[PDB]
Design an enzyme around this catalytic site. Structure first.
Site, PDB file in Angstrom:
ATOM      1  N   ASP D   9       0.807  -1.290  -0.138  1.00 53.00           N
ATOM      2  CA  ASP D   9       0.002  -0.045  -0.128  1.00 53.00           C
ATOM      3  C   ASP D   9       0.823   1.143   0.034  1.00 53.00           C
ATOM      4  O   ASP D   9       0.455   2.240  -0.247  1.00 53.00           O
ATOM      5  N   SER D  34       2.793   6.678  -0.142  1.00 57.42           N
ATOM      6  CA  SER D  34       1.886   6.075   0.325  1.00 57.42           C
ATOM      7  C   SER D  34       0.536   6.424  -0.183  1.00 57.42           C
ATOM      8  O   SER D  34       0.370   7.712  -0.141  1.00 57.42           O
ATOM      9  N   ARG D  35       0.071   5.743  -1.211  1.00 55.48           N
ATOM     10  CA  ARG D  35      -0.846   5.959  -2.167  1.00 55.48           C
ATOM     11  C   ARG D  35      -2.287   6.691  -1.643  1.00 55.48           C
ATOM     12  O   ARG D  35      -2.836   7.380  -2.396  1.00 55.48           O
ATOM     13  N   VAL D  36      -2.463   6.220  -0.461  1.00 59.99           N
ATOM     14  CA  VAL D  36      -3.902   6.708   0.192  1.00 59.99           C
ATOM     15  C   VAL D  36      -3.715   8.046   0.697  1.00 59.99           C
ATOM     16  O   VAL D  36      -4.518   8.909   0.653  1.00 59.99           O
ATOM     17  N   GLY D  37      -2.311   8.048   1.626  1.00 55.04           N
ATOM     18  CA  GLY D  37      -2.006   9.294   1.842  1.00 55.04           C
ATOM     19  C   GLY D  37      -2.536   9.532   3.328  1.00 55.04           C
ATOM     20  O   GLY D  37      -2.654   8.486   4.027  1.00 55.04           O
TER      21      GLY D  37
END
Lengths: 120, 120, 253, 169, 48, 116, 265, 116, 168, 85
Positions: D9, D34-37
């Site tokens: 992730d 962190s693709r989600v942030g």
């Protein structure tokens, strides 16, 4: 050619077209024979077959075959094994250029590029 | 002889008579004239080398007869014809500019140039 | 060094020089020199033979041949057999030399054999036991002890680097075994330095106290000096300083 | 590596070259994602580090241009000046962690360009000292940052003031 | 005003009927600034 | 130019050429600089930089990514707004005033936002 | 990949080689005009020098230097920086007027105090009388040039069309002009303001000449540098080409081993 | 920075960083030169070139092979030697002075040799 | 095609794309455990393609001039032409047309890069009228390629003329 | 990132800032850390446990290990049984 050389004594000259396609043909024959393709696909027996061909092209007592071969470089990569093996046999290299032909010079021959070991 | 020189050009780098407007009124130099230094005012200049006479409109400079009779004339730019109707129009606008305006001094100089133009 | 730069010729000159040593009376001085021609056109070797007999050097020298036409098993066994002859001289205590042109073609031969034995290709498609072959071959050559008759069998094996690729598996493997290497610069060869030697990609470390003491005294620090010439010409494209300029001038001469 | 990258992730790239370059810990932040942030982190620290990413990204672009020997305009050198100090701010000793209460100020200071003013050489001195100053006076502030984990308008102003108070040294 | 400034202005006026080449016009029309400095502190680049 | 109509095509064609120029010139700009490229080139580069961040648009689902409210722009409105930009009527708008915008109104609004 | 990262980087170097080539040609074109002007300019200067020589005029301190705002013209900027620096060891307290950002930057390091007047907007420009005149006018007013009885100007004399040697000359103030021994052979009034005027006129004329000599040397150096750049890039192209070719083969071989391993099963 | 001491670590840190910079700019240096790269970097590079040369130290078993008498430098001596060079105390003498020799005292002496 | 060709007629057969023919032969061969070869394509992929590409013919005039023009299409995966299937095919075919991506983007449709397109038969089957008025065209464009290496400033008039002619 | 160039140290750093919560209360914020070490030497492990014991973190750390010697099945099996814990 050998009938001319050996049995008519004659000095003869045998042109070959692409020796890339000689190699290429051999590479296929290994694979067809199932024999493990030696580096860069070429037959493991690439050297020996060329060797027989280009040592039956030589000066015997009787006569001599001489061969001018046409080498079509494989993707202009002379680091490739097939050009190197060819170069082993070669005594001269004639390097025709179309740039030179475009300078109106027919001979197409690019003089600086052309080099021979027979020049000595 | 005569050196008549501009930064990017040279007009006349044995000149016989030259007629010049300098801070000394107007001075004419004929063959040997004893060596001077005079700042050339913006000028209308005639240069005669032999009987042949050339007519120049010159943006002033400095004038120096050298002791070796090299008439070093240095000026920024010039022919008479090159300066020469639209120029008269522009100077009228410039005359208007003097009313308002270094720029004040500049416009006054433009009027001096208008006098120099009027000479033509 | 590189292909048909008269690679053979450099070695030939050594064999020729030893003629005031190979026609030199002392048997310590006498080398019996073996020229192994592997993968070479039989015609070219015949010209070499004629050259050798012209320089009348043939009579102290052997030619072993496993030409390009000659088959890969013969080629594979070609150095090994030659080294046995060399050992006969060595084991007479007598001094000898063997020059192997080209072990690179022996590698290609063992590659051919391995592939045809269906044995798996090693790195660069050259069998994994290629190292073993070279190492068993190479370490035969020796200077034996006085007890054993002070045998000699000097080895000058000739490796033909394609494209001057010296990172290549076969070259690096050979280099680690051998003591000293004599890499030859093609650019200089073409550019009229014959013989053309890399003044640091040729190394040796076993010949320096085996060379004549006169030529140790005179040659003192010249390697360093021409590695100052190397430095000088490195940074020339060093100073206009008289010392550096002097080195460039000395170097050129 | 490819298989794991898909599964994960985030990726937390560390680069060896940047270690030698002296960014210790050496983090290749260009590839650290962190693709989600952010929301899996503290709100206070989220607020302060809002433009930290932008500044660093701009610094990276600006820094690249400079090495082609093309003359730099003032706008690029504002970025450059800010960026350099930030890089020095990132560097931290191995086996030295830092409480979130004492990471929020340092990032606030940096993002609010107080350290962009302070000279590159003495950034390391400043970080230590800044913490000492807050430990003396605004240790109440540190406690609040820990306890409430957000920075109110008043707290942000207080914090701004604290940094300002320590603008001397 | 300075003598060479005086002559300069005269030269510029003098490149006016117009017929003139670009190079003449360029020697009489250039844009630039002069950033004064100090003993440090720089009075800003003011168009020359 | 007929499947999605001539205007849509032409506007997009101008974008493609402009960007392709920008990318090619990017290499020249790298060593030589943008100033050593023509006035026309400089304007093309400036438009490209503006267009580059005009592409930038936040998403509703990046109110949790970037935390920035999304922007939705009508099809007709997008075509119109890109045409305008290219015409350079909005080359009086800063590059960052195209960053994460929506419509033309937003491009203007972000100019005002930067202005304040 | 090795292969792709080599290939793109090699493409970059190729494009760079091409650009530095392109520049070298453009530089030659630009150079011709620069030199042409410089001949005429230098000739004009010699006429003034004819006075100064025959007059035997001769000579705080002013330092003026000329180089462009722009860089990448070679070491014109920095050979000039060094030779200014050499004469800044000769008098540290002299006030440097820096015409050019590049010469400014280097000198700014050795003394930033001495930078007193500077010129931005001269860099790309070829020599122009207007600029020299305006700089002179500001030089007189701002720096009070005559107060410093030493003036020194630095420029690059374009020694050869492959070389440049930084060179300097003084500009003669009215005090010098006054006390020159031959000045009676030259005839002008004692009530004339001609020394102070001739000073002013030659302030610009010498400065323009200094610019002309420098600019020609600069553009010539830039051509030389950009030619050598093409060559240097070429050498790296060749080195990485060999790497590329080897890498291409290496991918094939490594893949082939995988194919063989697969086939064996 | 405590296992081998802070001073040792600091000395080493500067060497690693400095050399890495010099290596980093090798591409640019080669295509161009150092008279087309920053002055600040050029000082670092000149220092680094000296450091690079400094790293030489003919061995005592290599004394035969190099042909240069061996050099064995104490750890206590080593830290001192690099420290000085990093502070450029003795940076002002030939790069060749640092070349093929050990300790700082030796470098100084080889500068004297070169000076003659 | 042979029926048309045999009837003496001419026709144009466009094999699109032989790259997908290659993959299919690969799939077929590998699944039949037939030996893999270069780029995991069977070795007689050459043999397959060559057989196909030699059936295209212009017969003898006693055999009624049975033409069968062909235009095989090869899809370049990452622009690779060094690839085993492209290299083979380029050699087998006489002529190639190689279009470039930049040209497509630059709105040049056709995006054919005629620097990398050649015809060997060429002017033998070029309209005579068109040959006359486009010998010049070849030369102008040739110059334009060389003069593409000026794209900054201070340039020869010849270069500037070329740029105008070439660009237009 | 490149092998154990403080790669191991990155993990130890996490443990250390998590010392504050672990030592601290809040059970749901107590990250009892599980360090899995595969293929690494006993000496490496031995240094780690000492460092961790010095830092008093083996009061909440669990170390699941499969040293370099410890078998290939055990190495394959080590993550999945660490996962179970």
């Amino acid at each position: 050619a050998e009938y001319f050389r050996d049995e008519e004594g004659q000095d003869v000259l045998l042109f070959i077209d692409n020796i890339f396609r000689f190699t290429q043909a051999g590479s296929e024959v290994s694979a067809l024979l199932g024999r493990i393709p030696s580096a860069v696909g070429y037959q493991p027996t690439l050297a020996t077959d060329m060797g027989l061909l280009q040592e039956r092209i030589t000066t015997t007592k009787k006569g001599s075959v001489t061969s001018v071969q046409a080498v079509y470089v494989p993707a202009d990569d002379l680091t490739d094994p097939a050009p190197a093996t060819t170069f082993a046999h070669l005594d001269a290299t004639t390097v025709l250029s179309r740039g030179i032909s475009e300078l109106g010079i027919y001979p197409a021959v690019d003089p600086l590029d052309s080099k021979s070991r027979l020049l000595d | 002889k005569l050196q008549f020189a501009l930064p990017h050009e040279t007009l006349y780098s044995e000149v016989t008579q030259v007629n010049l407007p300098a801070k000394s009124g107007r001075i004419g130099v004929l063959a040997n004239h004893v060596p001077t230094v005079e700042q050339l005012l913006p000028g209308v200049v005639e240069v005669m080398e032999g009987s042949n006479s050339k007519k120049f409109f010159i943006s002033g400079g400095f004038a120096t007869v050298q002791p070796d009779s090299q008439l070093c004339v240095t000026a920024i730019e010039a022919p008479l014809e090159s300066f020469s109707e639209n120029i008269k129009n522009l100077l009228a606008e410039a005359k208007k500019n003097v009313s308002s305006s270094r720029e004040a001094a500049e416009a006054a100089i433009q009027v001096e140039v208008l006098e120099n133009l009027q000479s033509v | 060094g590189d292909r048909q730069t008269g690679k053979t010729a450099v070695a030939l000159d050594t064999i020729l020089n030893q003629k005031r040593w190979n026609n030199g009376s002392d048997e310590s001085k006498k080398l019996y020199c073996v020229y192994v021609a592997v993968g070479q056109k039989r015609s070219t070797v015949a010209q070499l033979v004629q050259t050798l007999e012209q320089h009348d050097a043939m009579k102290y020298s052997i030619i072993v041949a496993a030409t390009a036409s000659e088959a890969a098993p013969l080629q594979y066994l070609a150095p090994f057999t030659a080294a046995s002859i060399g050992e006969w001289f060595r084991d007479n205590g007598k001094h000898a030399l063997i020059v192997y042109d080209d072990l690179s073609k022996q590698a290609v031969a063992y590659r051919q054999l391995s592939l045809l034995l269906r044995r798996p290709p090693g790195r660069e498609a050259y069998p994994g036991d290629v190292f073993y072959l070279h190492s068993r071959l190479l370490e035969r050559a020796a200077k034996l002890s006085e007890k054993e008759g002070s045998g000699s069998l000097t080895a000058l094996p000739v490796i033909e680097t394609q494209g001057g690729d010296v990172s290549a598996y076969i070259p690096t493997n050979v280099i680690s075994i051998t003591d000293g290497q004599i890499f030859l610069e093609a650019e200089l060869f073409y550019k009229g330095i014959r013989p053309a030697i890399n003044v640091g990609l040729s190394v040796s470390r076993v010949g320096s106290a085996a060379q004549v003491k006169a030529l140790k005294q005179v040659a003192g620090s010249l390697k360093l000096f021409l590695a100052q010439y190397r430095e000088v010409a490195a940074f020339a494209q060093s100073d206009l300083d008289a010392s550096t300029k002097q080195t460039l001038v000395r170097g050129e001469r | 590596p490819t298989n794991v990258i898909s599964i994960t992730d985030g990726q937390i790239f560390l680069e060896a070259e940047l270690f030698y370059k002296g960014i210790r810990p050496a983090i290749n932040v260009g590839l650290s994602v962190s693709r989600v942030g952010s929301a899996a982190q503290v709100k206070a620290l989220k607020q302060v580090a809002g433009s930290l990413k932008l500044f660093l990204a701009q610094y990276r672009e600006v820094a690249a241009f400079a090495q082609f020997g093309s003359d730099l305009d003032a706008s690029t050198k504002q970025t450059l000046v800010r960026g350099e100090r930030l890089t020095q701010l990132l560097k931290q000793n191995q086996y030295s962690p830092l409480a979130t209460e004492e990471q929020v100020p340092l990032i606030y200071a940096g993002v609010n360009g107080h350290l962009d003013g302070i000279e590159l050489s003495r950034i390391g001195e400043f970080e230590s000292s800044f913490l000492s100053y807050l430990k003396s006076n605004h240790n109440e502030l540190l406690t609040e940052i820990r306890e409430k984990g957000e920075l109110s308008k008043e707290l942000l102003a207080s914090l701004k003031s604290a940094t300002e108070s320590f603008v001397a040294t | 005003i300075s003598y060479a400034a005086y002559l300069n202005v005269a030269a510029q006026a003098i490149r006016s009927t117009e017929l003139q080449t670009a190079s003449v016009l360029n020697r009489s029309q250039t844009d630039a600034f002069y950033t004064q400095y100090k003993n440090a502190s720089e009075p800003t680049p003011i168009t020359k | 130019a007929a499947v999605v109509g001539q205007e849509h095509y032409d506007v997009a064609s101008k974008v493609q050429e402009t960007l392709q120029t920008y990318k090619s010139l990017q290499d020249i700009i790298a060593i030589l600089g943008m100033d050593e490229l023509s006035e026309q080139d400089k304007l093309t580069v400036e438009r490209a930089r503006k267009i580059q961040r005009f592409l930038s648009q936040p998403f509703a689902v990046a109110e949790v990514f970037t935390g920035i409210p999304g922007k939705l722009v009508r099809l007709k409105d997008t075509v119109a707004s890109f045409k305008a930009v290219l015409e350079g009527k909005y080359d009086n708008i800063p590059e960052h005033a195209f960053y994460m915008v929506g419509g033309i109104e937003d491009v203007v609004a972000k100019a005002e936002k930067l202005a304040a | 990949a090795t292969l792709k990262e080599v290939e793109m980087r090699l493409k970059s170097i190729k494009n760079i080689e091409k650009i530095t080539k392109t520049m070298k040609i453009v530089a030659s074109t630009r150079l011709s005009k620069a030199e042409k002007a410089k001949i005429s300019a230098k000739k004009m200067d010699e006429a003034e020098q004819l006075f100064y020589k025959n007059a035997e005029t001769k000579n705080k301190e002013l330092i003026v230097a000329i180089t462009s705002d722009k860089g990448l013209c070679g070491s014109i900027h920095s050979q000039l920086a060094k030779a200014v620096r050499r004469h800044l060891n000769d008098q540290p307290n002299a006030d440097i007027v820096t015409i050019g950002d590049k010469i400014k930057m280097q000198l700014l390091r050795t003394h930033p105090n001495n930078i007193k007047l500077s010129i931005n907007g001269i860099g790309k420009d070829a020599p122009t009388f207007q600029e020299s005149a305006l700089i002179a006018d500001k030089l007189l007013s701002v720096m009070k040039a005559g107060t410093y009885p030493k003036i020194s100007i630095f420029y690059n004399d374009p020694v050869s069309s492959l070389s440049f040697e930084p060179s300097e000359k003084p500009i003669f103030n009215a005090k010098t002009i006054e006390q020159s021994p031959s000045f009676g052979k030259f005839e002008i009034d004692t009530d004339a303001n001609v020394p102070r005027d001739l000073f002013e006129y030659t302030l610009a004329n010498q400065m323009l000449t200094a610019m002309a000599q420098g600019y020609a040397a600069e553009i010539s150096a830039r051509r030389n540098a950009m030619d050598n750049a093409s060559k240097n890039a070429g050498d790296m192209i060749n080195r990485y080409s060999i790497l590329y070719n080897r890498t291409r083969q290496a991918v094939i071989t490594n893949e082939l081993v995988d194919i063989i391993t697969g086939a064996s099963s």
